[PDB]
Amino acid sequence: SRGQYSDENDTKLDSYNPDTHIDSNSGKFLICYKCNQTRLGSWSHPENSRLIMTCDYCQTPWHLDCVPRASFKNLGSKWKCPLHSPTKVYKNYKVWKKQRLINKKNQLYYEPLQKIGYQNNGNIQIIPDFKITQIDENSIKYD
Amino acid sequence: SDKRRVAYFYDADVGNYAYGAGHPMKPHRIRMAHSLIMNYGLYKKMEIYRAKPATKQEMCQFHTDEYIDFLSRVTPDNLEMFKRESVKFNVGDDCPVFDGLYEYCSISGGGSMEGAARLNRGKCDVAVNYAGGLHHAKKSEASGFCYLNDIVLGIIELLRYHPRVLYIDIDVHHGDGVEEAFYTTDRVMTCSFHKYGEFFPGTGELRDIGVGAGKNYAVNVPLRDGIDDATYRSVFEPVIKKIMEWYQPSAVVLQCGGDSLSGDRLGCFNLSMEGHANCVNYVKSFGIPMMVVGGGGYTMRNVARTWCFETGLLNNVVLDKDLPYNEYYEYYGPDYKLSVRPSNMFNVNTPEYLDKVMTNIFANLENTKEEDSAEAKDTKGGSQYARDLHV
Amino acid sequence: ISLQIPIKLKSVLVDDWEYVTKDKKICRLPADVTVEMVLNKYEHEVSQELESPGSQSQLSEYCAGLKLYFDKCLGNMLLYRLERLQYDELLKKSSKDQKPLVPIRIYGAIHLLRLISVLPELISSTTMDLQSCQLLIKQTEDFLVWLLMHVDEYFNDKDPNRSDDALYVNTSSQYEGVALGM
Amino acid sequence: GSQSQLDLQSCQLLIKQTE
């Protein structure tokens, strides 16, 4: 709006939980990954109900108790589900910052010919200048 | 529990300052807390003390020279020309200026250094400073919707007598500047209770426990929108017990913030008189040196009620609910009783979430093991008592 | 007209934009590398890797023209709104000891690449002949090709949180408040 | 338990395996 780098940024009763536990996309129930409990609770005793926030990338369900979160954030950068690659993994040191994705005339390229001691420092598009190389799962298992 | 010598410092100039129209955070609560204390007959086990205004070159112990010189030069008639320093320190945009601003910062810093000096000379076991409590600001900032950080001014003033210093923040809008100033040093441990949701400080996390020598020595707990008294007891007692069983502090700075009471302009917590009393009561139970300071409170009735209750119990007397007649007789509630009723608002916090916080906190903490300085120059200020018992 | 900015350096520019605006980070004022040392490395390296039929003449001419361009057009298009007060205080410090205002030897190669990328924005809106434009585009493409190999030495992936060799200083709360204020 | 494993990097594996 004013020149920002836009990458991922945009007290009532139990009624929060039905508005979050039902997405009305397929008429099903979303179950968290750490625990296989939706924990919608009962209307008479709503204290056992747990708020669930979904991911903004892969729509992975997550309880507010499994991941150390205490509130829903809807202004600013969208919440990231912690089941993805780290953005600034630190190992003098190294600050990995990815190589992004290229949509300009398919410049990113796909050349799978080695997949051995590839040493491609990550950045793989897994299948069953800048070069996002192609990798397979057999090579990942082998190495 | 044990008998303690409680000292209380009040300045009459703190009450007669108004921040502005529509302003939640305000200093008028201090004068009514003082009036309730004076009319409740607590003077039998108390001494009154006058907060001297803060000297300029000792006020610069925390803040920068230009920031203090600007605060002594700021006034509503020249704020329009003060634009650079107005927007640089967030002064006049979110926190408007008023007559007697520098006077307020001077008397607040003086009261805080008075409490620190009374802790240093050891004549009084506990110092109570309701006049100060400005606990959100930083070295060159007025963020967190205040103007000074006089607690960190008073903490280092008591470092000479007390090597290990323990600070607790119990109200919402936690101490960003307090934990920021004592980040890298293990000498001062900053504990703060707040909600993950966006507040005036905005900061606070579960992984920002320290760097350098202060690593694993600044615990912050992210809470949710309103805690019941039992859940707050279960989240407060084990953490503080483990802290006092591991850190071994020699001083306690307790932030008596009324912002976490049942209903105010920006607060979102649901603790009654019992819930707010246990925070001070638990850290009183070890008997180590104590400094009670209070800056929170957006509603006058609730913060005055809890401050009168704290002043009552701190001297180990039974503080009754009835309010004696004063200048604010038709102020606190319809029934005029000293009890903040907890609202019927849901407990968002989870026992499983609390247990997870306990487990990661224990696993985090298991690895670890100036011409006037230290002076108490003031006046008692008890020769004349302004007790208005006549209608 | 538009020069072939390599995709790696486009990622570098986007990372710098993220650091400036979203991460709120600015470049080191006393930078270990400025435009002077990168052009010294240019003249020390690229001269002996090719023959000398006279290309060094307009090569050094373009280097001098770029150096002159980086002075006046620095304060015109460059300095994202965060860096305006750092420019002010830099010129105030330069004028404190009566030194002339020479800002080219202060900023590093990030601003140099940013000025390189902003060329087609204002090249098109003037009477500027294509005959020199083709040669300038080709030699600038050679410049980006040289920078590609040197991109790890010159824009190494580091952050200003645990070391002082990250070619970046992080913004402070007062500086953040006053930089975007006016 | 590795038993077997068989741009300009498209042919260096064969010579390394044979020699």
XYZ file of C-alpha atoms in Angstrom:
735
model
C 0.000 0.000 0.000
C 2.780 2.440 0.938
C 5.747 0.460 -0.401
C 5.920 -2.610 1.822
C 7.384 -5.981 0.870
C 4.199 -8.054 0.649
C 4.917 -11.793 0.791
C 2.387 -13.374 3.175
C 0.745 -10.449 5.002
C -2.840 -9.432 4.264
C -15.075 -12.122 24.419
C -18.158 -14.261 23.786
C -19.479 -17.764 24.497
C -18.485 -21.134 23.006
C -19.851 -19.950 19.608
C -16.268 -19.236 18.487
C -15.624 -22.987 18.236
C -18.471 -23.904 15.795
C -17.411 -20.958 13.620
C -13.864 -22.395 13.545
C -14.411 -26.171 13.757
C -16.688 -26.099 10.678
C -15.392 -24.559 7.449
C -18.516 -25.621 5.442
C -16.181 -26.561 2.565
C -17.028 -30.280 2.634
C -19.138 -30.738 5.786
C -16.384 -32.490 7.759
C -14.388 -31.902 10.944
C -10.747 -30.810 11.081
C -8.490 -32.728 13.481
C -5.219 -31.437 14.928
C -1.873 -33.063 14.142
C -0.203 -33.231 17.574
C -3.330 -34.745 19.150
C -6.116 -36.521 17.282
C -8.793 -34.659 19.272
C -10.976 -31.901 17.850
C -12.272 -31.172 21.390
C -15.340 -29.171 20.384
C -16.844 -29.855 23.807
C -20.435 -29.609 24.971
C -22.773 -26.628 25.212
C -23.615 -27.245 28.879
C -19.914 -27.273 29.878
C -17.927 -25.276 27.298
C -14.693 -25.138 29.344
C -13.425 -28.310 27.632
C -13.701 -26.613 24.230
C -10.382 -25.650 22.647
C -9.919 -23.013 19.961
C -8.340 -24.221 16.713
C -6.632 -21.964 14.179
C -6.006 -23.248 10.667
C -2.974 -22.591 8.504
C -3.002 -19.974 5.754
C -0.854 -22.084 3.384
C -1.840 -25.769 3.669
C -4.906 -25.398 5.968
C -3.415 -27.708 8.598
C -5.520 -27.825 11.793
C -3.759 -26.875 15.011
C -4.902 -26.577 18.613
C -3.968 -23.455 20.557
C -2.424 -25.653 23.278
C -0.097 -27.837 21.184
C 1.678 -24.848 19.607
C 2.492 -22.116 22.182
C -0.078 -19.588 20.962
C -2.645 -17.677 23.000
C -4.532 -15.454 20.529
C -5.684 -15.212 16.923
C -3.816 -12.725 14.728
C -5.647 -11.371 11.679
C -3.753 -8.102 11.054
C -0.206 -8.142 9.716
C 1.750 -11.191 8.588
C -0.365 -14.336 8.342
C 0.296 -17.080 10.861
C 2.635 -19.800 9.636
C 1.980 -23.388 10.587
C 5.233 -24.793 12.001
C 5.392 -27.757 9.585
C 7.382 -26.112 6.778
C 10.990 -25.380 5.894
C 12.653 -22.762 8.130
C 13.177 -19.389 6.476
C 16.329 -18.294 8.369
C 17.930 -21.528 9.597
C 21.215 -20.695 11.348
C 24.083 -23.189 11.563
C 31.348 -17.999 10.754
C 27.728 -19.028 10.196
C 25.218 -19.282 7.338
C 21.930 -17.420 6.894
C 19.882 -19.364 4.361
C 17.331 -17.139 2.608
C 16.005 -19.500 -0.121
C 16.116 -18.678 -3.847
C 12.383 -17.802 -4.192
C 10.222 -18.883 -7.151
C 10.376 -17.618 -10.742
C 7.275 -17.389 -12.943
C 8.914 -15.405 -15.780
C 8.801 -17.687 -18.855
C 9.528 -20.759 -16.673
C 13.022 -19.452 -15.925
C 13.384 -21.563 -12.754
C 14.153 -24.621 -14.964
C 13.964 -28.322 -14.116
C 17.031 -30.474 -14.744
C 17.088 -33.883 -13.032
C 20.219 -35.761 -14.106
C 22.312 -36.374 -10.987
C 20.367 -36.595 -7.722
C 23.555 -37.943 -6.119
C 25.668 -36.078 -3.570
C 23.682 -33.311 -5.212
C 24.688 -30.818 -2.474
C 22.032 -28.441 -3.812
C 21.764 -26.721 -0.350
C 18.026 -27.435 -0.200
C 15.491 -25.762 -2.515
C 14.056 -28.874 -4.148
C 10.747 -29.389 -5.943
C 10.122 -33.009 -4.979
C 8.418 -35.246 -7.557
C 7.307 -38.885 -7.421
C 21.927 -18.262 -12.356
C 18.953 -19.565 -10.390
C 18.104 -23.248 -10.824
C 15.429 -24.978 -8.735
C 16.563 -28.525 -9.459
C 14.233 -31.522 -9.481
C 14.622 -34.271 -6.874
C 12.972 -37.603 -6.200
C 12.121 -39.313 -2.921
C 14.308 -42.353 -3.657
C 17.372 -40.090 -3.675
C 16.277 -38.469 -0.397
C 15.865 -41.910 1.187
C 19.225 -43.085 -0.189
C 21.266 -40.108 0.976
C 2.431 -13.784 56.878
C 5.382 -12.578 58.939
C 5.452 -9.101 60.458
C 6.952 -6.557 58.059
C 7.767 -2.849 58.222
C 5.856 -1.329 55.296
C 6.802 2.140 54.036
C 4.508 4.169 51.787
C 5.488 7.298 49.844
C 2.892 9.678 48.415
C 3.049 13.112 46.800
C -0.069 15.278 46.744
C 0.939 16.745 43.364
C 0.480 13.338 41.679
C -3.290 13.496 42.116
C -3.918 16.911 40.547
C -2.515 16.005 37.114
C -4.918 15.161 34.288
C -3.471 13.547 31.178
C -6.307 14.657 28.906
C -9.897 14.214 27.826
C -10.903 10.644 27.077
C -7.667 9.381 28.621
C -7.853 5.949 30.339
C -4.427 6.008 31.973
C -4.398 8.813 34.524
C -2.814 9.815 37.861
C -6.010 10.660 39.770
C -6.301 7.072 41.059
C -3.248 7.682 43.264
C -4.876 10.474 45.277
C -8.017 8.436 45.935
C -5.927 5.416 46.912
C -4.107 7.738 49.322
C -7.426 9.062 50.651
C -8.794 5.542 51.175
C -5.581 4.561 52.983
C -5.740 7.702 55.131
C -9.415 7.229 56.002
C -9.110 3.476 56.659
C -6.966 4.104 59.752
C -3.817 2.390 58.465
C -1.536 5.048 60.005
C -1.140 3.026 63.225
C 1.382 0.698 61.538
C 2.470 3.126 58.807
C 4.666 6.169 58.310
C 3.933 8.755 55.620
C 6.765 10.021 53.425
C 7.080 12.849 50.901
C 8.540 12.144 47.452
C 11.174 14.745 46.611
C 11.264 15.773 42.922
C 13.923 13.957 40.921
C 17.209 15.797 40.465
C 18.084 16.295 36.790
C 21.555 14.737 36.671
C 20.429 11.702 38.691
C 17.300 11.320 36.542
C 19.636 10.750 33.556
C 20.789 7.486 35.187
C 18.339 5.580 32.946
C 17.334 7.943 30.138
C 19.428 10.001 27.736
C 20.389 13.619 28.383
C 18.416 15.067 25.465
C 15.278 13.084 26.370
C 15.281 14.385 29.962
C 16.090 17.928 28.808
C 13.181 17.731 26.346
C 10.847 16.456 29.079
C 11.828 19.376 31.314
C 11.191 21.720 28.357
C 7.977 20.182 26.975
C 4.632 21.937 27.469
C 1.410 22.263 25.416
C 2.261 25.773 24.183
C 5.440 24.677 22.336
C 4.666 21.072 21.309
C 3.836 22.288 17.789
C 7.452 23.455 17.377
C 8.783 20.374 19.189
C 7.748 18.109 16.295
C 10.993 16.142 15.864
C 11.320 15.127 19.518
C 7.528 14.774 19.702
C 7.436 12.012 17.079
C 10.874 10.582 17.917
C 9.872 9.455 21.428
C 6.103 9.024 20.759
C 5.104 12.130 22.700
C 1.943 14.026 21.785
C 0.819 11.530 19.127
C -0.319 8.630 21.324
C 0.534 10.235 24.693
C -0.458 13.926 24.722
C 1.371 16.553 26.736
C -0.070 18.602 29.573
C 0.859 21.113 32.245
C 3.223 19.693 34.846
C 4.546 16.731 32.850
C 8.141 17.188 34.025
C 6.791 17.618 37.553
C 5.065 14.226 37.313
C 8.202 12.486 36.028
C 10.294 14.200 38.719
C 8.020 13.213 41.605
C 7.562 9.660 40.263
C 11.299 9.091 39.880
C 11.832 10.653 43.291
C 9.323 8.298 44.885
C 10.910 5.296 43.178
C 14.429 6.281 44.247
C 13.026 6.938 47.739
C 11.676 3.393 47.886
C 14.995 2.071 46.596
C 16.921 4.058 49.222
C 14.604 2.875 52.004
C 15.371 -0.634 50.757
C 19.089 0.213 50.802
C 19.285 1.593 54.346
C 17.061 -1.224 55.610
C 14.918 0.709 58.093
C 11.759 -0.454 56.280
C 11.357 -3.998 54.975
C 8.739 -3.154 52.317
C 8.400 0.067 50.316
C 5.069 0.914 48.674
C 5.108 3.493 45.864
C 1.731 3.988 44.228
C 2.739 7.435 42.919
C 5.168 5.932 40.414
C 4.499 2.742 38.497
C 5.372 4.128 35.068
C 6.742 0.829 33.787
C 6.277 0.811 29.991
C 8.783 3.405 28.752
C 12.412 2.923 27.698
C 15.702 4.840 27.617
C 14.622 7.253 24.864
C 10.961 6.370 24.495
C 7.501 7.118 25.847
C 5.996 3.994 24.288
C 3.680 1.694 26.163
C 1.441 4.731 26.707
C 3.436 6.207 29.619
C 6.403 8.578 29.959
C 9.053 7.093 32.280
C 10.426 3.788 33.522
C 10.952 4.632 37.186
C 10.971 0.984 38.311
C 14.205 0.388 36.402
C 15.348 3.711 37.873
C 14.681 2.277 41.332
C 15.914 -1.249 40.616
C 19.500 -0.191 39.884
C 19.376 2.245 42.812
C 18.911 -0.837 45.031
C 21.496 -2.953 43.208
C 24.212 -1.816 45.621
C 22.502 -3.395 48.637
C 20.699 -6.140 46.670
C 22.838 -8.037 44.122
C 20.037 -10.326 42.890
C 16.814 -8.482 42.016
C 13.508 -10.159 41.127
C 10.742 -8.239 39.344
C 7.164 -9.418 38.760
C 4.602 -7.868 36.414
C 1.082 -9.196 36.966
C -1.075 -6.773 34.949
C -1.723 -6.596 31.212
C 0.480 -4.227 29.178
C 3.616 -5.781 30.632
C 7.028 -4.218 31.198
C 8.675 -4.028 27.781
C 11.245 -1.512 29.010
C 11.754 -3.334 32.311
C 12.774 -6.628 30.705
C 14.555 -4.784 27.881
C 16.846 -2.813 30.211
C 17.883 -5.925 32.183
C 18.124 -8.306 29.221
C 21.777 -9.339 29.115
C 22.548 -9.386 32.862
C 21.687 -12.126 35.359
C 21.656 -9.616 38.236
C 18.031 -8.570 37.606
C 15.430 -11.193 36.676
C 12.292 -9.814 35.006
C 9.109 -11.891 35.247
C 6.009 -10.573 33.498
C 2.445 -11.840 33.048
C 0.637 -10.600 29.938
C -1.544 -11.680 27.020
C -0.219 -12.646 23.575
C -2.706 -10.214 22.026
C -1.541 -6.811 20.868
C -1.126 -4.297 23.703
C 0.612 -0.999 24.381
C 4.009 -2.763 24.769
C 3.270 -5.292 22.020
C 6.344 -7.333 22.957
C 6.544 -10.460 25.106
C 7.159 -14.067 24.092
C 7.967 -17.503 25.484
C 11.346 -17.842 23.764
C 12.792 -14.391 24.592
C 14.044 -15.443 28.037
C 17.489 -13.889 27.722
C 20.777 -13.444 25.894
C 24.331 -13.391 27.201
C 24.659 -13.506 30.979
C 20.917 -12.883 31.339
C 20.076 -15.969 29.283
C 17.200 -18.035 30.749
C 16.812 -15.246 33.352
C 13.872 -13.159 32.051
C 10.727 -15.298 31.981
C 7.614 -14.062 30.161
C 4.328 -15.990 30.171
C 1.766 -15.372 27.380
C -1.722 -15.548 28.872
C -5.180 -15.480 27.288
C -8.259 -13.244 27.407
C -9.173 -13.552 31.067
C -8.005 -15.978 33.755
C -10.023 -17.415 36.616
C -8.656 -17.079 40.141
C -7.927 -20.809 40.491
C -6.170 -21.011 37.113
C -4.108 -17.912 37.919
C -3.192 -19.514 41.255
C -2.113 -22.699 39.457
C -0.064 -20.667 36.957
C 1.457 -18.341 39.597
C 2.359 -20.519 42.599
C 4.592 -23.178 40.920
C 6.440 -20.682 38.693
C 7.249 -18.286 41.536
C 8.064 -21.188 43.871
C 10.557 -22.590 41.349
C 12.004 -19.104 40.772
C 12.597 -18.528 44.489
C 13.940 -22.085 44.820
C 16.415 -21.596 41.942
C 17.197 -17.895 41.422
C 17.635 -17.098 45.143
C 16.859 -13.360 44.860
C 17.594 -10.841 47.587
C 14.943 -8.304 46.515
C 11.440 -8.267 45.031
C 9.958 -5.501 42.878
C 6.219 -6.144 42.564
C 4.230 -4.241 39.939
C 0.789 -3.635 41.472
C -0.886 -2.960 38.154
C -4.648 -2.529 38.216
C -4.861 -3.017 34.452
C -5.614 -6.739 34.973
C -8.805 -6.158 36.971
C -12.358 -7.215 36.106
C -13.294 -4.446 33.705
C -11.357 -1.402 32.518
C -10.723 0.501 29.287
C -7.944 -1.705 27.877
C -7.655 -4.550 30.388
C -8.847 -8.041 29.548
C -8.312 -10.088 32.741
C -10.878 -11.328 35.257
C -9.266 -11.516 38.707
C -11.220 -10.601 41.834
C -9.799 -9.361 45.152
C -8.580 -12.856 45.990
C -6.890 -13.278 42.630
C -5.057 -9.951 42.798
C -4.085 -10.398 46.461
C -2.368 -13.763 45.947
C 0.256 -12.232 43.636
C 1.535 -9.929 46.390
C 0.773 -12.469 49.139
C 2.843 -15.257 47.573
C 5.962 -13.127 47.076
C 5.501 -11.702 50.568
C 5.614 -15.235 52.025
C 9.408 -15.584 51.683
C 10.214 -12.476 53.737
C 13.043 -11.241 51.484
C 13.247 -7.454 50.835
C 10.278 -6.093 48.904
C 9.330 -3.025 46.854
C 5.661 -2.685 45.871
C 5.024 -0.281 42.983
C 1.825 0.388 41.050
C 1.105 2.045 37.714
C -1.715 0.044 36.177
C -5.414 0.703 36.463
C -7.717 2.327 33.920
C -10.850 2.371 36.116
C -10.649 4.282 39.396
C -12.980 2.106 41.453
C -11.255 -1.209 40.727
C -7.666 0.016 41.062
C -8.455 1.996 44.223
C -10.214 -1.049 45.696
C -7.303 -3.385 44.984
C -4.728 -0.844 46.201
C -6.618 -0.341 49.466
C -6.843 -4.129 49.831
C -3.100 -4.525 49.191
C -2.313 -1.755 51.675
C -4.589 -3.487 54.175
C -3.165 -6.996 53.993
C 0.430 -5.886 53.543
C 0.322 -4.681 57.168
C -1.319 -7.997 58.223
C -4.681 -6.512 59.225
C -8.201 -7.549 58.251
C -9.362 -5.042 55.647
C -13.137 -4.865 55.783
C -15.315 -4.244 52.734
C -17.059 -1.159 54.147
C -15.758 2.216 52.968
C -15.611 5.129 55.432
C -16.933 8.466 54.227
C -14.465 10.522 52.191
C -14.364 12.977 49.285
C -15.086 10.019 46.959
C -17.893 8.510 49.025
C -20.254 8.275 46.028
C -17.609 6.775 43.740
C -17.054 3.016 44.137
C -20.021 0.965 43.003
C -23.700 1.013 43.952
C -23.352 -0.979 47.184
C -20.116 0.847 48.169
C -18.124 -2.251 49.116
C -14.407 -2.920 48.646
C -14.743 -5.922 46.342
C -14.210 -6.051 42.576
C -16.696 -8.593 41.272
C -15.227 -10.975 38.662
C -17.187 -10.721 35.434
C -19.012 -13.702 33.925
C -16.536 -13.858 31.048
C -15.081 -17.065 29.663
C -11.792 -18.669 30.728
C -9.855 -18.926 27.467
C -6.795 -20.431 29.184
C -6.455 -24.234 29.164
C -5.084 -26.502 31.918
C -3.267 -28.442 29.184
C -1.803 -25.202 27.806
C -0.802 -24.175 31.335
C 0.840 -27.576 31.864
C 2.741 -27.205 28.580
C 3.948 -23.747 29.648
C 5.009 -25.196 33.016
C 6.921 -28.051 31.370
C 8.808 -25.881 28.886
C 9.549 -23.256 31.562
C 10.992 -25.899 33.912
C 13.011 -27.465 31.081
C 14.270 -23.967 30.243
C 15.208 -23.099 33.838
C 16.715 -26.469 34.811
C 20.027 -25.704 33.077
C 20.716 -22.517 35.055
C 21.756 -22.267 38.700
C 25.557 11.897 40.832
C 25.933 14.092 43.917
C 23.028 12.294 45.667
C 23.333 8.493 45.582
C 21.870 6.016 48.099
C 20.285 8.935 49.963
C 16.909 9.171 51.706
C 16.611 12.953 52.001
C 12.906 13.778 52.355
C 10.273 14.951 54.844
C 7.671 12.921 56.734
C 4.868 15.271 55.678
C 2.485 14.116 58.395
C 2.211 17.322 60.407
C -1.090 18.229 58.708
C -3.702 15.583 57.870
C -6.360 16.413 55.271
C -9.069 14.137 56.658
C -12.460 15.370 55.414
C -14.855 13.598 57.775
C -17.445 16.415 57.660
C -20.082 16.732 54.941
C 16.508 -0.275 -23.021
C 15.912 -2.468 -19.982
C 19.120 -4.225 -18.973
C 19.252 -7.940 -18.189
C 19.257 -7.925 -14.392
C 20.104 -11.504 -13.365
C 17.540 -13.309 -11.248
C 20.027 -13.763 -8.387
C 20.526 -10.003 -8.183
C 16.767 -9.470 -8.436
C 16.486 -11.698 -5.361
C 19.222 -9.587 -3.743
C 17.259 -6.390 -4.451
C 14.039 -7.905 -3.083
C 15.907 -9.080 0.031
C 17.312 -5.570 0.508
C 13.810 -4.116 0.093
C 12.508 -6.578 2.699
C 15.337 -5.654 5.076
C 14.709 -1.928 4.598
C 10.912 -1.923 4.914
C 9.577 -5.127 6.486
C 12.614 -6.118 8.568
C 13.487 -2.414 9.120
C 17.250 -2.625 8.541
C 19.618 -0.099 6.964
C 23.106 -0.440 5.527
C 26.310 0.237 7.445
C 27.343 3.884 7.256
C 30.998 3.108 7.836
C 30.762 0.261 5.334
C 33.885 -1.836 4.847
C 33.068 -1.875 1.110
C 31.866 1.198 -0.797
C 31.789 2.016 -4.520
C 35.471 3.019 -4.448
C 36.708 -0.448 -3.475
C 34.367 -2.287 -5.862
C 35.628 -0.150 -8.752
C 39.213 -0.663 -7.556
C 38.565 -4.417 -7.680
C 37.094 -3.922 -11.168
C 40.216 -2.165 -12.459
C 42.482 -4.657 -10.671
C 40.691 -7.730 -12.079
C 39.035 -7.126 -15.458
C 42.019 -5.375 -17.067
C 44.327 -8.398 -17.397
C 41.655 -10.941 -18.417
C 41.230 -9.395 -21.884
C 43.286 -7.821 -24.647
C 43.874 -4.061 -24.881
C 42.766 -2.628 -28.242
C 41.488 0.535 -26.530
C 38.499 -0.770 -24.521
C 40.082 0.436 -21.263
C 39.474 4.037 -22.388
C 35.677 3.964 -22.469
C 35.690 1.349 -19.680
C 37.313 3.842 -17.295
C 35.174 6.595 -18.839
C 32.002 4.678 -17.941
C 33.376 3.976 -14.457
C 34.040 7.695 -13.912
C 30.613 8.604 -15.295
C 28.978 6.109 -12.977
C 30.945 7.488 -10.035
C 29.736 10.993 -10.899
C 26.187 9.657 -11.345
C 26.211 8.028 -7.896
C 26.733 11.404 -6.166
C 23.828 13.619 -7.266
C 21.354 10.842 -8.099
C 21.900 9.269 -4.696
C 19.831 11.890 -2.900
C 17.306 12.063 -5.762
C 15.961 8.515 -6.212
C 17.765 6.491 -3.513
C 17.387 6.636 0.300
C 14.191 4.774 1.152
C 12.204 6.799 3.729
C 14.041 5.070 6.598
C 17.466 6.322 5.439
C 16.654 10.043 5.095
C 17.685 10.930 8.646
C 20.826 8.801 8.349
C 21.673 10.877 5.263
C 20.961 14.041 7.225
C 23.183 13.040 10.127
C 25.918 11.849 7.747
C 25.999 15.225 5.996
C 25.859 16.990 9.381
C 28.885 14.993 10.562
C 30.649 15.748 7.268
C 29.971 19.473 7.740
C 31.014 19.356 11.416
C 34.722 19.071 10.533
C 34.360 21.268 7.395
C 34.744 18.242 5.109
C 33.100 18.465 1.668
C 29.847 16.570 1.175
C 31.009 13.511 -0.780
C 28.494 10.676 -0.215
C 29.815 8.197 -2.810
C 32.498 6.780 -0.484
C 29.914 6.121 2.272
C 27.356 3.721 0.783
C 28.154 0.186 -0.324
C 27.390 -1.910 -3.380
C 23.702 -2.359 -2.472
C 22.966 1.256 -3.396
C 25.198 0.848 -6.463
C 23.120 -2.098 -7.693
C 19.940 -0.178 -6.831
C 21.104 2.753 -8.977
C 21.981 0.259 -11.728
C 18.454 -1.183 -11.639
C 16.776 2.257 -11.721
C 18.445 3.318 -15.002
C 15.592 2.430 -17.457
C 13.115 4.362 -15.284
C 14.626 7.706 -16.338
C 16.660 6.742 -19.429
C 13.499 6.527 -21.556
C 12.224 10.021 -20.660
C 14.989 11.989 -22.402
C 16.571 12.511 -25.821
C 19.262 9.847 -25.455
C 20.709 8.141 -28.527
C 20.446 4.379 -29.021
C 23.982 4.040 -30.439
C 25.590 4.680 -27.055
C 22.643 2.966 -25.340
C 23.432 -0.439 -26.866
C 27.082 -0.265 -25.774
C 26.107 0.947 -22.293
C 23.590 -1.903 -21.928
C 26.175 -4.467 -23.069
C 28.899 -3.225 -20.724
C 26.430 -2.982 -17.833
C 25.417 -6.585 -18.556
C 29.116 -7.432 -18.288
C 29.095 -5.554 -14.957
C 26.208 -7.695 -13.652
C 27.957 -10.842 -14.927
C 31.066 -9.836 -12.962
C 28.916 -9.107 -9.902
C 27.360 -12.560 -10.141
C 30.631 -14.309 -9.342
C 31.402 -11.722 -6.675
C 27.892 -11.856 -5.151
C 28.903 -14.150 -2.264
C 31.888 -12.005 -1.276
C 29.987 -8.740 -1.668
C 26.455 -9.549 -0.418
C 27.135 -12.438 1.955
C 24.045 -13.810 3.688
C 24.325 -12.487 7.247
C 22.063 -10.645 9.682
C 22.682 -7.902 12.285
C 21.900 -9.968 15.389
C 25.082 -11.857 16.367
C 27.967 -10.265 14.415
C 29.091 -6.898 13.065
C 30.105 -8.061 9.553
C 26.583 -8.315 8.100
C 26.805 -4.992 6.144
C 23.645 -3.924 7.999
C 22.693 -1.984 11.127
C 19.215 -2.496 12.541
C 16.779 0.353 13.103
C 16.092 1.722 16.573
C 12.654 2.635 17.887
C 13.375 6.374 17.982
C 15.009 6.220 14.539
C 12.103 4.172 13.161
C 9.598 6.645 14.599
C 11.350 9.769 13.329
C 12.402 8.387 9.921
C 8.846 7.612 8.775
C 7.372 10.609 10.607
C 8.658 13.308 8.273
C 24.574 -49.969 3.745
C 25.674 -48.549 0.398
C 26.443 -51.222 -2.211
C 26.225 -49.383 -5.549
C 25.403 -45.963 -6.969
C 25.427 -46.490 -10.760
C 25.633 -29.267 -17.067
C 29.249 -30.397 -16.699
C 28.350 -32.688 -13.767
C 26.585 -35.208 -16.032
C 29.652 -37.406 -16.627
C 31.996 -37.234 -13.610
C 30.223 -40.100 -11.812
C 30.970 -42.636 -14.562
C 34.715 -41.931 -14.656
C 34.839 -41.940 -10.842
C 33.092 -45.325 -10.732
C 35.230 -46.872 -13.483
C 38.509 -45.356 -12.256
